């Protein structure tokens, strides 16, 4: 906090640093698990066109700098974005009469659904501790 | 509305992840309701012996599905079901119910009855070349 | 290595992962989803 | 759905500008150290903010010298009283 | 967009005095008054208002102090600062830094305790 105040003093008020919101980690883990399922959380919001979690500006974690924590959370949000977007791409479900990708593609998407099921199983296997 | 899958309204104050899981599972419940309705209606003698027998087999499978659903309810009562575990367990049920609803909707759109119902079942079996179940 | 071993001796001086994955799947995968062994 | 993606990029650009400012401030601190100015991180930041406000360097230098003499007398009194 | 409450130069000077003295604002009131008197006094324009000229003067002064390496480092840092373009008044900051430079070779003339007599 002292260093951020010093940086703001040096920046002469021009760098409106987003206010560091201190959140308990025992919550950050929940947000991470939601990201692993592509779910937006209080700190990470889902950008629908990108199917991507967006970190809330000014996330502060105890014991770490809010900027470094934000960087870590940005990487985790990128991973969650990849998971959710890949799920959506693979989520093309039914070989309806409008399905033009053929049976080989449909079987590929079935295998991908199996893979994503295994991924979900792994995510659920992740202990929240 | 018609021979369509049932749509559901979810309480807006639910957790977004819970609401999305509910909306993902509800398609299975709607398909199950449609298949059970088709089985119970077309099992009447007026639908002909072929359509009646198909509906009866669907009704038996719906009974097995209800048994499965009751077992899932029991698992929920034990607290051993997580949202990801719930989603995984309903995924096979979701796909089976979706196949059953697609067959029901194909019979209904074709108004398939008796031998026509057998034609619709054959055409659905050819349509399920990629779906062994 | 031979020197160190001889010096210490004279001075008296000083599939399983697949099974684990199967158990994890059984604990976390739905009964009906076939495990893909390459994916597993 | 598109709009949500833009705010992240805008925030990243603002953070990059802030990081560049921080780097510049660190460079200025290093220069002051090389110049043996005697400013600490808090004092250096205050000096930077004051300089941004237009203070005359001759007046600032005289004020700094007088403040340093007063601070030295106060520090000697504080060290004598402890 | 509420540009961070950059407290007026008097408040900033008071905070600076408190930081330098290591005392609370209430303990530096006489020093604050002295600062206000100094700041209100007309100061002559700085000898050089050119960033590059100021950097060259700093390098020359460091060379006069036999700090040629420090002169080169100063010239490099000045080039970097000019290229960064974050500071609006490069000439003023350079003049301040030049005024605040201290010669490590000149043994500090230990300020006789007598200077405190005028501080009151």
From Swiss-Prot, chain B:
Tissue specificity comment? Ubiquitously expressed.
Q: What subcellular locations does the record give? A: Cytoplasm, Cytoskeleton, Microtubule organizing center, Centrosome
Q: How does it assemble?
A: Component of the gamma-tubulin ring complex (gTuRC) consisting of TUBGCP2, TUBGCP3, TUBGCP4, TUBGCP5 and TUBGCP6 and gamma-tubulin TUBG1 or TUBG2. TUBGCP2, TUBGCP3, TUBGCP4, TUBGCP5 and TUBGCP6 assemble in a 5:5:2:1:1 stoichiometry; each is associated with a gamma-tubulin, thereby arranging 14 gamma-tubulins in a helical manner. Gamma-tubulin at the first position is blocked by TUBGCP3 at the last position, allowing 13 protafilaments to grow into a microtubule.
Family according to the record: Belongs to the TUBGCP family.
What is known about what this protein does? Answer: Component of the gamma-tubulin ring complex (gTuRC) which mediates microtubule nucleation. The gTuRC regulates the minus-end nucleation of alpha-beta tubulin heterodimers that grow into microtubule protafilaments, a critical step in centrosome duplication and spindle formation. Plays a role in neuronal migration.
Protein name per UniProt: Gamma-tubulin complex component 2
Q: Which organism is it from?
A: Homo sapiens (Human)
- List the gene name: TUBGCP2
Q: Which residues of the full protein are shown?
A: 239 to 371 of 902
Curated annotation (Swiss-Prot), chain C:
Compartments, record wording:
Cytoplasm, Cytoskeleton, Microtubule organizing center, Centrosome
Q: In which tissues is it expressed?
A: Widely expressed, with highest levels in heart and skeletal muscle and moderate levels in brain.
Family note:
Belongs to the TUBGCP family.
Description of how the protein assembles with itself and partners = Component of the gamma-tubulin ring complex (gTuRC) consisting of TUBGCP2, TUBGCP3, TUBGCP4, TUBGCP5 and TUBGCP6 and gamma-tubulin TUBG1 or TUBG2. TUBGCP2, TUBGCP3, TUBGCP4, TUBGCP5 and TUBGCP6 assemble in a 5:5:2:1:1 stoichiometry; each is associated with a gamma-tubulin, thereby arranging 14 gamma-tubulins in a helical manner. Gamma-tubulin at the first position is blocked by TUBGCP3 at the last position, allowing 13 protafilaments to grow into a microtubule.
Q: What does this protein do?
A: Component of the gamma-tubulin ring complex (gTuRC) which mediates microtubule nucleation. The gTuRC regulates the minus-end nucleation of alpha-beta tubulin heterodimers that grow into microtubule protafilaments, a critical step in centrosome duplication and spindle formation.
What name does this protein carry? Gamma-tubulin complex component 5
This protein's species is: Homo sapiens (Human)
Q: Give the organism's phylogenetic lineage.
A: Eukaryota, Metazoa, Chordata, Craniata, Vertebrata
Supply the gene name. TUBGCP5
Full-length numbering of the shown residues: 594 to 647 of 1024
From Swiss-Prot, chain D:
Its cellular-component GO annotations read:
centrosome; cytosol; gamma-tubulin ring complex; interphase microtubule organizing center; spindle
What is the residue range of the signal peptide feature? Answer: none
Query: What are the subcellular locations of this protein?
Result: Cytoplasm, Cytoskeleton, Microtubule organizing center, Centrosome; Cytoplasm, Cytoskeleton, Spindle
Residues modified to N-acetylalanine: 2
Keyword Cytoplasm in record: yes
Q: Which keywords does UniProt give here?
A: Acetylation, Cytoplasm, Cytoskeleton
- One Gene Ontology term from the biological process aspect of the record: gamma-tubulin complex localization
Q: Name one Pfam family in it.
A: MOZART1
Q: Which proteins does it associate with, and in what oligomeric form? A: Associates with the gamma-tubulin ring complex (gTuRC) consisting of TUBGCP2, TUBGCP3, TUBGCP4, TUBGCP5 and TUBGCP6 and gamma-tubulin TUBG1 or TUBG2; within the complex, interacts with TUBGCP3 and TUBGCP6 to form a luminal bridge with actin that stabilizes the initial structure during complex assembly. Interacts with TUBG1.
The entry assigns this protein to a family as follows: Belongs to the MOZART1 family.
Q: Entry's PANTHER family?
A: MITOTIC-SPINDLE ORGANIZING PROTEIN 1
From the Swiss-Prot or TrEMBL record, give the protein name. Answer: Mitotic-spindle organizing protein 1
UniProtKB/Swiss-Prot annotation, chain E:
| Sequence positions bearing N-acetylalanine | 2
The subcellular location is:
Cytoplasm, Cytoskeleton, Microtubule organizing center, Centrosome
Q: Which residues are annotated with the PTM Phosphoserine?
A: 113
Q: List the disulfide bonds.
A: none
Q: Which domain of life is it from?
A: Eukaryota
What tissues contain this protein? Ubiquitously expressed.
Family, according to the entry, reads as follows: Belongs to the TUBGCP family.
Quaternary structure, per UniProt, is: Component of the gamma-tubulin ring complex (gTuRC) consisting of TUBGCP2, TUBGCP3, TUBGCP4, TUBGCP5 and TUBGCP6 and gamma-tubulin TUBG1 or TUBG2. TUBGCP2, TUBGCP3, TUBGCP4, TUBGCP5 and TUBGCP6 assemble in a 5:5:2:1:1 stoichiometry; each is associated with a gamma-tubulin, thereby arranging 14 gamma-tubulins in a helical manner. Gamma-tubulin at the first position is blocked by TUBGCP3 at the last position, allowing 13 protafilaments to grow into a microtubule.
Q: What is the purpose of this protein?
A: Component of the gamma-tubulin ring complex (gTuRC) which mediates microtubule nucleation. The gTuRC regulates the minus-end nucleation of alpha-beta tubulin heterodimers that grow into microtubule protafilaments, a critical step in centrosome duplication and spindle formation.
Could you identify this protein by its name? Gamma-tubulin complex component 3
Which organism is this protein's natural source? Answer: Homo sapiens
Gene, per the UniProt record = TUBGCP3
